[PDB]
Symmetry: C3
Subunit: 238 residues, 3 copies
């Protein structure tokens, strides 16, 4: 996160840090608790990931320093990538992790509500992007979970800023005209959380942008409300 500040412990209790153990253990991406066995994250996070066996999901974390060999985590039973996903910049950048065990909810770890199709008309005015990603394009993973308040930008405006792309209605953009606050490398898959009528909603999934926090380059997020049918379908037992 560029231009953000340190979070208060547990103020984003749906935020997880997804680690890979290969070759050695490191933070890979953000994600969001949306169900007792379910993390919603970005498909692009799994480039070159051939097995869920190398993944570990840590909940209730503020500082990466909390994570040691003796720290408890959730194993991943299954990675579900949207069947139309090819790459972040073409959309469908959404994935589910089915956990091996269930999350016991508490003040530090609880699920975020999905957006309602009826809130499509809502103007979200209190939106935050969070993560342990870079503070600049070439940097490193940050210890303390960072937050930045960023305004949503219309898809018409977003399209103006990305003339070489198609910004679709399945994407949502957020950024300041002058830049300065944005997601960056390592924030991928985490939430764009918007508080509306005293309820936090998972409006976006951190996906891509050209650089980080540049002027006239809004961050591009997966528009979660366009995938609530897909999420429902994929989270049913069979």
């Amino acid at each position: 996160i560029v231009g953000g500040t340190a979070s208060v412990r547990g103020e984003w209790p749906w935020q997880v840090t997804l680690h890979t153990t290969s070759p050695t253990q490191r933070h890979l991406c953000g994600g969001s608790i949306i169900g007792n066995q379910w993390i919603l994250t970005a498909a692009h996070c799994f480039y070159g990931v051939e097995s869920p066996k190398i993944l570990r999901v840590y909940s209730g974390i503020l500082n990466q320093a909390e994570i040691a060999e003796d720290t408890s985590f959730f194993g991943v039973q299954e990675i579900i990538i949207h069947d139309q996903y090819k790459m972040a910049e073409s959309g469908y950048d959404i994935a589910l992790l089915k956990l091996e065990t269930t999350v016991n909810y508490a003040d530090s770890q609880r699920p975020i509500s999905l957006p309602s199709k009826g809130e499509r008309n809502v103007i979200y005015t209190d939106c935050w992007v969070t993560g342990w990603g870079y503070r600049k394009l070439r940097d490193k993973i940050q210890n303390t979970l960072q937050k930045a308040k960023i305004p949503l930008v219309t898809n018409e405006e977003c399209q103006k800023r990305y003339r070489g792309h198609k910004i679709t209605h399945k994407m949502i953009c957020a950024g300041y005209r002058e830049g300065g606050k944005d997601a960056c490398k390592g924030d991928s898959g985490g939430p764009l959380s918007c508080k509306h009528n005293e309820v936090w909603h998972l409006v976006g999934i951190t996906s891509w942008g050209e650089g980080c926090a540049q002027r006239e380059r809004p961050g591009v997020y997966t528009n979660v409300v366009e995938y609530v049918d897909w999420i429902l379908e994929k989270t049913q037992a069979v």
Copy 2:
């Protein structure tokens, strides 16, 4: 209907009573006129129904006592159950009855409008559940069509009350925190009708709940607006 009152004749002119003739004739479920040849109702009503030949749809009824051997009814040509339906508590609790003959509309029998996808944002504040069902969990079918005004509850709130279920965006809930007013056995398949801008809309189909009218147990209804595409598809000739 628990905690309701007797309806005025024809104040719910889309409400039908669906009877089965097997083994002897009795009220089975409620339903709603949505087209000249079409009743919308709940899939769960047809458990163990092997043929539409045993079904009779009566329109323009206030009192069950109106129904005798010499009372006119509509035959059922086809029962269309949602292909994803398994049971009420897992959703997709929706079915269409294609009638053998067409309903001639009149003051006592006319169709209710389907909800618009653009009204998803609307806060419906004038919603009523109607039927000839039980006034308590163990009771019997009531003679006079009952009505009860019940407030909609958010899906977030509804999910809190049904921790052992998944309350999906294809469901909608209604109830008082303190209970006392609700649908019950025999009200299944009938409408949750909401009046907005002087027009009645078929917002829900009476589906299920834990008991009837209990504290902290909202009634769960099929969220009709999520099925307008399905209804359109299934009501086309071929």
Copy 3:
């Protein structure tokens, strides 16, 4: 267009005139620029059209007199008709033209934004229908692009006026109770453009009506917002 007036040059810069060259060259239908290589229009326009080779799309036109043998145009590479289209009156009256070359945008030719699913709740109050069609049921193609401001009508109201049809949620209607302003023959496939929050949105595609501008006979338009998923799907490369 019945009851309309002459447009100002380029005030509808997304409006194209689609010509057929067979047997000799003539205006066939309207259409709208929605992308650099993409025109959105009505499926019914292509009755008896067996090849895209006979089609020419002219942008930046006010007067048909501008079009001569030496006037530049866009060739059509592909006609994409909705796979459920059968005829205008049954809906799915939507088609895409993929152009052979790309449109270079300018003040006289630029794309119109598609409606957002979140604007379904919006009451559009500034809507215009445009084209070179007839000024009365039996007439001829008009030289100067005509415009008429027409109010949207609810689908409930529209259905009342077309008792022999099914007016679906994939249609949108516009007209005056007393008639007098409407699309007519030759306006097919053009836009119903509505300006909301200083942005023009392509709300409808001119489709059909009983006669032109008759009392109690609103024009029926393809409800574009119901097809944004389809448009996205069909405009992707493969």
